[PDB]
Design a binder for this molecule. Structure first.
Ligand SMILES: [Mg+2]
Lengths: 69, 217, 125, 79, 115, 107, 87
């Protein structure tokens, strides 16, 4: 369904990897929120739908975790 | 030799000194910021510092639909459509919070007013915000874009078919039947163009003004 | 001095939950820093807002102008806009419904925004 | 390094994840089938595990462990 | 300039406006001592048999130089407590709303595009 | 009190009232408008039924809608006319017998 | 029309010594090329503000110091200055 299941997981690890480098924010809230995002959406999707969701996550990573200090 | 319109004085009983004083101030701002040559119908990108923030800059790109004003108060309007919402900002050339003016695409259009673009189809009003500038040739004459736009249903902002507007950039044939075109010609004043006391000749004024502008350089 | 570091420490001391700090690129002309923090109840929300404003006036800003407290008529969402920072304090359910974090994190890829399409107006035949 | 320590420490951290509900956390607890941890779920076990033992684990093969014993060896032989 | 009986375009994603209905909303009251309404002025709409508060975010009438003139009279619906009814605004909103006296930070938070 | 025709319908709009018919008509089970107006199948949305009724009666208007680039006049089906005819059929009794006050009388 | 009217409390933004031009805030009664009467404001706030100004009058023959061609008020943004950036 996704561009690649490997990329899907790769994205998550990357996000969580940076998740422990934040300073001015609730580190726990970050983890929790992200988990809900991935889970709720990725469980069932189509090629086009899954392509968009993974793409939005990809840009978030490449934008200083969405400017989230 | 392109003399910017704002320098040309309007006729009246105001003293020439009032204009000389203003020109000196106008030339002073131009040295600090260069105001590029542009005409109605050319696409411009204007970067202005927002006063509602901490000197952060804003950018707006659009086609210059109108140019008006004399002296240090001269203005130009330029339109664009953003997420399917038309917007027009009337900028002031000499406002000291205009960081930069870039002529993305320099050209001339059949008319010197493009207000009718409000009633034309959205395509003729939408321009890409991120478009890169097109090349220009200094030792050449500016191109004249002869595009004739297509209008939306008849109820318009104004009666553009009427002879007083003198619009030459609308496809009247498609949107109006010849019966309407004949009827609209009942407001035509043929004598206007042929009465010699209504014409303001600025050739000598432009010649003297051009010399002064170069001399100050 | 009054800065983001002082504000977050002030918010942490008063024990707010889920404090999120999103930087805003200079391109957007809204604010340098965007702050969202949840609160236990309406009473707690009022206390936090009052404390921050009280500290703000005390903490220098002698030349800098004053800041209004907005949303007092509202019972669950209060927003205070400082010169270069904006803080929104709201209850958990209000935070969940509006999802301010997602919009500013994902500028144009927010799920709610995606659902908002464009249209035109053709005749009916 | 202590082999028993790695096992109990890996088992200790694995115990804490109420997300996995350690109803049966045998040293050979199959992360995927026994615990029903999706590809996403098994990773967070690693990533969280990485924090415990100074990380340095590459996911290339950390997604093939699927049992506390193997991951114990995976780190024991990497330490 | 918005007056009594003007026709308005709701620019939220809220169901109250979003839903296509044969009649547009019409202004019933302008919250000013001046009967006229400009950018940042609240108004009371009559939208689908319901009386609902709203805020003007743009209009077709010219304003002062360096401000944006829109092609439609744009309005956002606000609850009685003052919280916006809708959660998103995809149409550009002028940045003057920030400094006008009043409560506009909530609306600005919901607006992604500013002109 | 407006359903039966006791008060002038334009005081209520005739659009917050046509909806009420569909609710009670469907609620009470009198699925007669489908056959009379040859609708596809039962429904509970005015915009849909009044779309069907309008087409059946071949009635359309030229209505000004306000889009993002400016007002435009677009021909559209008469939602207003359908509401009247839908009301005027009900009141004529060809849509069935009704007991608007029900569960208030039994009690 | 054609009546004597007075405007009160108009600020002076700049003076041009070379051409003897005064820049006065806002509008002044009369048409262009109309002669006007200029005198210090009689409003309560500016009761004794003429302490700083030349008390009898400004004498250029005295030549105590030669004035710049253009005099400005501090708030005024002069042309030829860097563009305003509200940093
Ligand atoms: Mg008009």
């Amino acid at each position: 369904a996704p561009w690649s299941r490997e990329a899907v997981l790769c994205l998550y690890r990357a996000l969580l990897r940076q998740g422990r480098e934040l300073r001015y924010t609730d580190r726990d809230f970050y983890f929790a929120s992200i988990r809900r995002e991935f889970r709720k959406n990725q469980k069932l999707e189509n090629l086009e739908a899954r392509e968009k969701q993974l793409e939005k996550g990809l840009v978030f990573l490449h934008s200083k975790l969405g400017g989230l200090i | 030799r392109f003399l910017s319109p704002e320098f040309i004085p309007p006729r009246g009983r105001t003293n020439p000194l009032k204009f000389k004083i203003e020109r000196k101030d106008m030339l002073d701002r131009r040295k600090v910021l260069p105001i590029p040559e542009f005409y109605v119908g050319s696409i411009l990108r204007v970067t202005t510092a927002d006063p509602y923030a901490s000197g952060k800059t804003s950018q707006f790109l659009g086609i210059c639909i109108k140019r008006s004003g004399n002296g240090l108060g001269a203005t130009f309007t330029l339109r664009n459509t953003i997420e399917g919402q038309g917007v027009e900002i009337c900028f002031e050339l000499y406002n000291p919070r205009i960081q930069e003016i870039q002529v993305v695409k320099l050209e001339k259009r059949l008319d010197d007013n493009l207000l009718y673009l409000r009633d034309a189809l959205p395509e003729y009003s939408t321009f890409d915000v991120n478009m890169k500038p097109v090349p220009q040739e200094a030792c050449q004459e500016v191109p004249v874009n002869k595009l004739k736009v297509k209008m939306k249903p008849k109820p318009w902002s104004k009666r553009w078919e009427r002879p007083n507007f003198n619009i030459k950039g609308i496809r009247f044939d498609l949107a109006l039947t010849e019966e309407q075109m004949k009827e609209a010609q009942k407001w035509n004043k043929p004598w206007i163009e042929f009465d010699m006391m209504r014409e303001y000749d600025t050739s000598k004024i432009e010649a003297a003004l051009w010399e002064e502008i170069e001399a100050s350089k | 001095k009054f800065d983001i570091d002082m504000l977050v420490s002030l918010l942490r001391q008063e024990n707010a939950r889920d404090i999120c700090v999103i930087q805003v690129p200079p391109e957007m002309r809204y604010t340098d820093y965007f702050v969202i923090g949840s609160g236990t109840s309406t009473r707690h929300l009022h206390a936090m807002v009052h404390y921050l404003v009280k500290m703000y006036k005390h903490l220098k800003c002698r030349s800098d102008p004053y800041v209004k407290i907005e949303g007092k008529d509202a019972d669950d969402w209060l927003c205070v806009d400082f010169g270069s920072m904006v803080i929104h304090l709201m209850l958990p359910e209000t935070r969940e419904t509006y999802e301010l974090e997602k919009l500013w994190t994902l500028r144009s890829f927010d799920d709610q925004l995606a659902q908002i399409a464009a249209e035109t107006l053709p005749e009916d035949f | 390094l202590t082999l028993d320590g790695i096992k109990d420490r890996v088992l200790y951290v694995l115990k804490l994840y109420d997300k996995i509900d350690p109803e049966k956390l045998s040293v050979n607890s199959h992360f995927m089938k026994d615990l029903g941890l999706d590809s996403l779920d098994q990773v967070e076990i690693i990533m969280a595990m990485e924090d415990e033992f100074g990380f340095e684990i590459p996911d290339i093969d950390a997604e093939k462990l699927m049992c506390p014993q193997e991951i114990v060896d995976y780190i024991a032989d990497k330490k | 300039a918005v007056q009594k009986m003007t026709r308005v375009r709701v620019v939220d994603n809220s169901a109250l406006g979003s839903t296509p209905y044969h009649r547009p909303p019409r202004c019933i009251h302008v919250y000013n001592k001046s009967g006229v309404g400009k950018v940042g002025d609240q108004i009371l709409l009559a939208i689908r048999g319901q009386k609902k508060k709203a805020l003007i975010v743009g209009h077709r009438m010219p304003g002062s130089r360096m401000t944006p003139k829109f092609d439609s009279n744009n309005v956002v619906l606000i609850e009685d407590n003052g919280n916006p009814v809708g959660t998103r605004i995809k149409i550009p909103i002028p940045t003057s709303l920030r400094r006008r006296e009043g409560e506009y930070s909530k609306v600005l938070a919901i607006a992604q595009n500013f002109v | 009190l407006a359903l039966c025709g006791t008060v002038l319908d334009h005081l209520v709009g005739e659009e917050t009232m046509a909806d009420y018919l569909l609710y009670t008509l469907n609620r009470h089970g009198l699925f007669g408008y489908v056959q009379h107006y040859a609708l596809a199948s039962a429904c509970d949305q005015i915009e849909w039924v009044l779309k069907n009724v309008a087409i059946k009666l071949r009635k359309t208007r030229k209505v000004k809608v306000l889009t993002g680039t400016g007002n435009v006049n677009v021909i559209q089906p008469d939602y207003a006319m359908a509401a009247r005819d839908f009301l005027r059929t009900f009141r004529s009794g060809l849509l069935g017998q009704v007991m608007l006050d029900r569960d208030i009388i039994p009690a | 029309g054609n009546q004597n009217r007075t405007v009160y409390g108009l600020k002076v933004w700049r003076v041009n010594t070379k051409h003897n031009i005064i820049y006065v805030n806002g509008s002044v009664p009369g048409h262009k090329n109309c002669l006007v009467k200029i005198k210090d404001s009689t409003l309560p706030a500016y009761k004794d503000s003429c302490k700083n100004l030349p008390f009898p009058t400004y004498f250029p023959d005295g030549d105590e110091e030669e004035l710049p061609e253009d005099l400005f008020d501090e708030s005024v943004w002069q042309p030829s200055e860097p563009s305003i950036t509200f940093a």
